[PDB]
Amino acid sequence: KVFGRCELAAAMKRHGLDNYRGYSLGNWVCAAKFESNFNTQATNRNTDGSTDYGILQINSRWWCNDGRTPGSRNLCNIPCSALLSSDITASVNCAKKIVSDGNGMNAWVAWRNRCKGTDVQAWIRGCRL
Ligand SMILES: [Cl-]
Ligand SMILES: [Cl-]
Ligand code: NA
Protein backbone atom coordinates (compact mmCIF):
# COMPACT_ATOMS: atom_id res chain seq x y z
CA LYS A 1 0.00 0.00 0.00
CA VAL A 2 1.24 3.52 -0.81
CA PHE A 3 -0.21 5.83 1.84
CA GLY A 4 -1.13 9.42 1.26
CA ARG A 5 0.75 11.90 3.49
CA CYS A 6 -2.24 12.87 5.71
CA GLU A 7 -3.57 9.26 5.55
CA LEU A 8 -0.30 7.97 7.07
CA ALA A 9 -0.18 10.81 9.64
CA ALA A 10 -3.70 9.76 10.76
CA ALA A 11 -2.76 6.03 10.94
CA MET A 12 0.45 6.81 12.89
CA LYS A 13 -1.55 8.94 15.40
CA ARG A 14 -4.25 6.23 15.80
CA HIS A 15 -1.35 3.72 16.59
CA GLY A 16 0.11 6.08 19.30
CA LEU A 17 3.25 7.51 17.53
CA ASP A 18 2.05 11.15 18.04
CA ASN A 19 4.81 12.48 20.40
CA TYR A 20 6.05 8.90 21.16
CA ARG A 21 9.35 9.34 23.12
CA GLY A 22 8.93 13.11 22.44
CA TYR A 23 8.92 12.79 18.60
CA SER A 24 6.07 14.81 17.05
CA LEU A 25 3.99 13.21 14.26
CA GLY A 26 5.84 15.24 11.57
CA ASN A 27 9.13 13.52 12.50
CA TRP A 28 7.53 10.09 11.92
CA VAL A 29 5.86 11.12 8.60
CA CYS A 30 9.18 12.71 7.39
CA ALA A 31 11.11 9.52 8.31
CA ALA A 32 8.54 7.38 6.40
CA LYS A 33 8.72 9.71 3.36
CA PHE A 34 12.50 9.34 2.91
CA GLU A 35 12.71 5.68 4.02
CA SER A 36 9.86 4.26 1.82
CA ASN A 37 8.03 7.15 0.00
CA PHE A 38 5.06 5.90 2.13
CA ASN A 39 5.08 2.40 0.49
CA THR A 40 4.47 -0.44 2.96
CA GLN A 41 6.02 -2.95 0.44
CA ALA A 42 9.44 -1.15 0.24
CA THR A 43 12.49 -3.46 0.71
CA ASN A 44 16.19 -2.61 0.39
CA ARG A 45 19.22 -4.93 0.79
CA ASN A 46 22.10 -3.66 3.02
CA THR A 47 25.83 -4.22 2.20
CA ASP A 48 26.07 -6.58 5.26
CA GLY A 49 23.34 -8.94 3.81
CA SER A 50 20.54 -7.61 6.11
CA THR A 51 17.35 -6.18 4.53
CA ASP A 52 15.21 -3.15 5.48
CA TYR A 53 11.41 -3.66 5.39
CA GLY A 54 8.31 -1.49 5.16
CA ILE A 55 7.32 2.14 5.63
CA LEU A 56 10.11 2.78 8.22
CA GLN A 57 12.70 0.43 6.59
CA ILE A 58 13.22 -1.73 9.73
CA ASN A 59 16.47 -3.75 9.49
CA SER A 60 16.56 -7.61 9.80
CA ARG A 61 20.05 -7.15 11.41
CA TRP A 62 18.28 -6.50 14.81
CA TRP A 63 14.48 -6.23 14.63
CA CYS A 64 12.78 -8.92 12.53
CA ASN A 65 13.32 -12.49 11.26
CA ASP A 66 13.72 -13.06 7.49
CA GLY A 67 15.68 -16.37 7.72
CA ARG A 68 18.58 -15.00 5.54
CA THR A 69 20.50 -12.57 7.84
CA PRO A 70 23.22 -14.69 9.52
CA GLY A 71 23.94 -13.83 13.17
CA SER A 72 20.98 -11.39 13.32
CA ARG A 73 18.42 -10.83 16.12
CA ASN A 74 14.61 -10.56 15.97
CA LEU A 75 14.02 -8.08 18.86
CA CYS A 76 10.46 -7.19 17.67
CA ASN A 77 9.65 -10.97 17.56
CA ILE A 78 8.00 -10.76 14.07
CA PRO A 79 8.67 -12.10 10.60
CA CYS A 80 10.03 -9.18 8.50
CA SER A 81 7.14 -9.92 6.07
CA ALA A 82 4.70 -8.46 8.72
CA LEU A 83 6.43 -5.09 8.16
CA LEU A 84 5.10 -5.05 4.52
CA SER A 85 1.38 -5.26 5.42
CA SER A 86 -1.21 -2.63 4.37
CA ASP A 87 -1.86 -2.60 8.20
CA ILE A 88 1.01 -0.54 9.84
CA THR A 89 0.45 -2.04 13.35
CA ALA A 90 3.60 -4.27 13.26
CA SER A 91 5.83 -1.48 11.80
CA VAL A 92 4.56 1.02 14.42
CA ASN A 93 4.92 -1.41 17.40
CA CYS A 94 8.48 -2.34 16.28
CA ALA A 95 9.42 1.37 15.64
CA LYS A 96 8.39 2.10 19.29
CA LYS A 97 11.00 -0.49 20.46
CA ILE A 98 13.66 0.95 18.06
CA VAL A 99 13.17 4.63 19.08
CA SER A 100 13.26 3.50 22.79
CA ASP A 101 16.70 1.83 22.25
CA GLY A 102 18.86 4.83 23.37
CA ASN A 103 19.56 6.89 20.14
CA GLY A 104 15.94 7.95 19.59
CA MET A 105 15.15 8.60 15.91
CA ASN A 106 18.89 8.71 15.00
CA ALA A 107 18.41 4.91 14.52
CA TRP A 108 16.97 6.02 11.13
CA VAL A 109 20.02 7.49 9.33
CA ALA A 110 17.63 9.17 6.76
CA TRP A 111 15.75 10.85 9.66
CA ARG A 112 19.12 12.21 11.02
CA ASN A 113 20.20 13.31 7.51
CA ARG A 114 16.89 14.67 6.05
CA CYS A 115 14.36 15.35 8.88
CA LYS A 116 16.32 16.21 12.07
CA GLY A 117 16.30 19.96 12.71
CA THR A 118 13.94 20.74 9.76
CA ASP A 119 10.38 22.16 9.87
CA VAL A 120 8.87 18.64 10.25
CA GLN A 121 5.39 20.15 11.07
CA ALA A 122 5.11 20.79 7.26
CA TRP A 123 4.59 16.98 6.89
CA ILE A 124 1.21 17.14 8.79
CA ARG A 125 0.19 20.68 7.57
CA GLY A 126 -3.46 20.65 6.44
CA CYS A 127 -4.16 17.13 7.81
CA ARG A 128 -7.39 16.31 9.72
CA LEU A 129 -5.84 14.78 12.93
CL1 LIG B 1 4.18 13.89 0.31
CL1 LIG C 1 16.39 -11.89 19.10
NA1 NA D 1 16.90 -10.97 12.12
Amino acid letter at 90?
Answer: A
Q: State the method.
A: X-ray
Determine the topology of domain 1-129 in CATH: Lysozyme (1.10.530)
Q: Which resolution in angstroms does this entry have?
A: 1.5
CA distance 85 to 25: 21
CA distance 84 to 80: 8
CA distance 28 to 57: 12
> Is 119 labeled as ligand-binding?
no
Question: Ligand 3 centre from 65 Cα, in Å?
Answer: 4
Task: Single out the residue of 109, 112, 123 nearest to residue 47, CA to CA.
Answer: 109
- Does residue 7 carry a catalytic annotation? no
- Does residue 52 carry a catalytic annotation? yes
